[PDB]
Write an enzyme that holds these catalytic residues in place. Structure first.
Site, PDB file in Angstrom:
ATOM      1  N   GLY A  22      49.437 -87.170 -61.272  1.00  0.00           N
ATOM      2  CA  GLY A  22      48.293 -87.906 -61.807  1.00  0.00           C
ATOM      3  C   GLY A  22      47.265 -87.246 -62.704  1.00  0.00           C
ATOM      4  O   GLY A  22      46.997 -86.054 -62.601  1.00  0.00           O
ATOM      5  N   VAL A  24      47.278 -88.021 -66.132  1.00  0.00           N
ATOM      6  CA  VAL A  24      48.011 -87.725 -67.359  1.00  0.00           C
ATOM      7  C   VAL A  24      48.431 -88.984 -68.099  1.00  0.00           C
ATOM      8  O   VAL A  24      49.371 -88.965 -68.882  1.00  0.00           O
ATOM      9  CB  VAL A  24      49.259 -86.870 -67.057  1.00  0.00           C
ATOM     10  CG1 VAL A  24      48.859 -85.581 -66.362  1.00  0.00           C
ATOM     11  CG2 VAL A  24      50.206 -87.629 -66.175  1.00  0.00           C
ATOM     12  N   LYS A  26      49.725 -91.597 -66.841  1.00  0.00           N
ATOM     13  CA  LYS A  26      50.978 -92.070 -66.281  1.00  0.00           C
ATOM     14  C   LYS A  26      51.039 -93.588 -66.280  1.00  0.00           C
ATOM     15  O   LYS A  26      52.032 -94.161 -66.714  1.00  0.00           O
ATOM     16  CB  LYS A  26      51.175 -91.514 -64.865  1.00  0.00           C
ATOM     17  CG  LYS A  26      52.522 -91.823 -64.241  1.00  0.00           C
ATOM     18  CD  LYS A  26      52.382 -92.899 -63.200  1.00  0.00           C
ATOM     19  CE  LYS A  26      51.562 -92.400 -62.038  1.00  0.00           C
ATOM     20  NZ  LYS A  26      50.864 -93.528 -61.354  1.00  0.00           N
ATOM     21  N   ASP A  50      51.006 -96.976 -56.526  1.00  0.00           N
ATOM     22  CA  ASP A  50      49.681 -96.373 -56.606  1.00  0.00           C
ATOM     23  C   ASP A  50      48.678 -97.330 -55.964  1.00  0.00           C
ATOM     24  O   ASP A  50      48.444 -98.429 -56.478  1.00  0.00           O
ATOM     25  CB  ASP A  50      49.301 -96.101 -58.059  1.00  0.00           C
ATOM     26  CG  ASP A  50      47.988 -95.339 -58.190  1.00  0.00           C
ATOM     27  OD1 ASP A  50      47.778 -94.693 -59.242  1.00  0.00           O
ATOM     28  OD2 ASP A  50      47.166 -95.381 -57.248  1.00  0.00           O
ATOM     29  N   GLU A 212      48.931 -78.977 -70.653  1.00  0.00           N
ATOM     30  CA  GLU A 212      48.130 -77.927 -70.052  1.00  0.00           C
ATOM     31  C   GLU A 212      48.970 -77.107 -69.085  1.00  0.00           C
ATOM     32  O   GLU A 212      50.082 -77.487 -68.756  1.00  0.00           O
ATOM     33  CB  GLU A 212      46.916 -78.526 -69.347  1.00  0.00           C
ATOM     34  CG  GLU A 212      45.998 -79.320 -70.266  1.00  0.00           C
ATOM     35  CD  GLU A 212      44.933 -80.073 -69.499  1.00  0.00           C
ATOM     36  OE1 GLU A 212      44.757 -79.781 -68.296  1.00  0.00           O
ATOM     37  OE2 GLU A 212      44.283 -80.959 -70.095  1.00  0.00           O
TER      38      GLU A 212
END
Ligand SMILES: [Zn+2]
Lengths: 303, 303
Positions: A22, A24, A26, A50, A212
């Site tokens: 999570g 990102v 999604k 989710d 990242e």
């Protein structure tokens, strides 16, 4: 070939899982992919586990534990299910006492028995293609692992005498008369799910991340865990990266520098993956029109 | 009270660990804290187990497996040790065969035996205060867990007859004559380390992160794991967040929006933590002068 075209093309596909640790984008990715898929298929379903009702927040509409056509589309339906609820719903609905004595030896049979019924429902509604939006935290792959957890429990039950007739028969119904055969006919049901999950023609997975360090790390651990689960994967979308080659903001320049060196690592580690790059949108993506326009960058490389 | 002042004040502190799931300016923070500590203590040591020789890259100098005074300071020394090396160094230096048969039952005794000797060395050099810079990936807390791993191994060895005299005596020396007592005198050495680690007057931990989703998640898992290890923690520094209230860059505005909502979550979850906020520096922090100036924001809130 940096684009998710290869998913719209492979029409044999019946299940497509999308996941990523999570934070990102999604959810946006799951939706954008479901919209694009609905343009080239008869019936598409977009389900999310989710609990944060992320699917509702994205379309504006409210979705729930049963399939509702999505406002703005012909063939796209969406449902939003939480397992922890489906667990207490199905248990009181009964035995679980026994299942508890099972519950500590086998961690997460309840979560897996849930998934077992969720799937039998999806199968019955016969959608041409269904897109699974996994949870953003913890074990993002619990769902693909549910046959494994069941099969363990079935090994522990095989050695058990009668008198567990109640719970064996009780498990059997939530999946799909009597005898030891019914104990071996679940094994055949499980074996069926596994076959499909592990068959690249039928089900594949798409990872999403951001450029990242931490997100690369957690993503690799997920791809290793996948090949381990024997689930196919050949797409990876990297979000919220900013790619204006000549940018003037000193900060955005720093960001872009870091990003571009990790995006370089990705490009290299995954020659065998369609790596699709999509930009950081200034506004939060919301509404069935902002989503349509966004899904564009998943099928057409952005510059 | 958003500043690490409370660490410079507590003079009883002998060990300060700083950690965070890499990519969050963890190294810069460790250094900045070591500098500030050196101004108010007699002798400070900054050790790092990050194999990436991150400590060297930061100061310009090259550091290694033994304490070298840091160029630019009177009382600050720095060493940069890799366990995987210290393992093969100490084993060939011998028995490990036995230790191997130990190695599979007890995962990571070699990594823990290493830490055991690293510590006995640090203790011998008698620094007033030592700052530990943990690794950025995997188990960021292996070090604090080393007594635990040893104590298991000692439980497995207690039931073993003689003839293991070699390895019991061999373990005993790398930590700190003969009999079964020497087997029980290590237990006393271990118990000692544990007491200190778990004693808030002597050793605390400082978490570092960035204001994103994934970094919050991994950081919570780390704080839970900590209270579980019984190690005290009451500081948390959040890096590379950009706080110019009125910024004009559309991207930086988006970033700041996201950041500010997670920084809000942090502020709320950790009323009992000094949460210190520090900005994103455009240039990479390098050199004993850039570091001095940066360490400023760890003791004086930035605006
Ligand atoms: Zn900017």
């Amino acid at each position: 070939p940096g684009t998710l075209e290869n998913l719209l093309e492979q029409t044999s596909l019946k299940w497509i899982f999308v996941g990523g640790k999570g934070g990102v984008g999604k959810t946006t990715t799951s939706c954008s992919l479901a919209i694009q898929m609905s343009k080239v298929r008869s019936s598409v379903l977009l389900i999310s586990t989710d609990p944060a009702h992320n699917l509702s927040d994205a379309f504006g509409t409210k979705f729930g534990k049963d399939a509702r056509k999505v406002p703005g589309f012909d063939n796209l339906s969406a449902m939003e299910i939480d397992p922890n609820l489906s667990i207490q719903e199905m248990t009181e609905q009964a035995l679980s006492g026994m299942m508890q004595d099972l519950a500590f030896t086998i961690p997460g049979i309840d979560e897996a028995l849930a998934f077992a019924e969720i799937l039998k429902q999806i199968k019955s509604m016969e959608f041409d293609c269904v897109i699974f939006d996994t949870a953003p935290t913890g074990h993002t792959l619990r769902f693909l692992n549910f046959p494994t957890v069941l099969e363990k429990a079935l090994g522990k039950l095989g050695g058990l005498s009668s008198r567990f007739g109640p719970m064996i028969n009780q498990m059997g119904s939530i999946m799909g008369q009597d005898l030891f055969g019914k104990m071996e006919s679940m094994r055949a049901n499980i074996s069926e799910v596994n076959k499909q999950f592990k068959n690249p023609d039928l089900t594949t997975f798409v990872c999403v991340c951001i450029s990242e360090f931490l997100s690369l790390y957690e993503t690799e651990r997920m791809i290793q865990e996948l090949t381990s689960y024997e689930i196919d994967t050949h797409n990876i979308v990297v979000n919220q990266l900013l790619l204006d080659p000549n940018t003037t903001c000193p900060q955005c320049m720093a960001r872009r520098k870091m990003q571009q060196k990790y995006l370089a690592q990705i490009e290299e580690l995954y020659e065998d993956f369609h790596v699709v790059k999509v930009p950081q949108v200034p506004a939060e993506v919301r509404g069935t029109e902002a989503l349509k326009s966004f899904s564009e960058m998943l099928v057409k490389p952005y510059v």
